[PDB]
């Protein structure tokens, strides 16, 4: 065999997968603060788009320029209804996803406490 150790720092793409490595070359996972923008990395390091559970509540990490000229994958200050394909969500005044039983515009809904996706039908 032949092997060489390298170092990756910062915002990095391999093919269509986006990673963040910190100063020490160490890959980052989960809910991550990069210079005060918040991001979500899967358990395999790969940056995710969609709604994920954080200490701060369920947040929407979105493609660049979804709202307020946000960065690829950043948490955004979304409010209202959101459809991400077959999955539906509702974001509060506090920019987190609603969970449990809620009345929205005079109709009752239920959103799964574990995913925040609307439970329909």
């Amino acid at each position: 065999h032949h092997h060489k150790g390298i170092m990756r720092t910062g915002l990095i793409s391999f093919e269509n997968n986006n990673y963040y490595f910190n100063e020490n070359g160490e890959m980052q996972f989960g809910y991550i603060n990069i210079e005060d923008k918040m991001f979500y990395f899967g358990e395999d390091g790969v940056m995710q788009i969609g709604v994920f559970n954080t200490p701060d509540g369920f947040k929407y990490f979105a493609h660049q320029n979804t709202l307020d000229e946000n960065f690829e994958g950043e948490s955004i200050n979304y409010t209202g209804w959101l459809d991400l394909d077959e999955k539906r969500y509702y974001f509060t005044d506090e920019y987190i996803a609603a969970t449990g039983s809620v009345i929205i515009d005079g109709e009752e809904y239920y959103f799964d406490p574990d995913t925040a996706q609307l439970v329909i039908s």
Partner: nanobody
Amino acid sequence: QVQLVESGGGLVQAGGSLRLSCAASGLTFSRYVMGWFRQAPGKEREFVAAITWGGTPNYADSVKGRFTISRDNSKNTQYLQMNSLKPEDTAVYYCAAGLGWDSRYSQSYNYWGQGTQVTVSS
């Protein structure tokens, strides 16, 4: 409506120095990763240097240690300090602003300057 203006370009002797300036209007400047690319006639446009919204810089291999990028978020301006200049550094230099993931890549940028000529003589 969105404009990036280069300046500070022009002619310089080898081993000498230049400071490229890019002035941004038409966007929330503090939100973009700002970058510099270069194209020398005969060559493809290549990444040069980039800077995060929080000021963390990164550089192509061949300018590392010689160039220094920086940003003034209060003036909507970014700077490329070019030291120890070489004939290899001769190119049109373009500033760009972007929201895409990897700094090193032309497609990570959505806004582009007109470019300014940097000529270096032996």
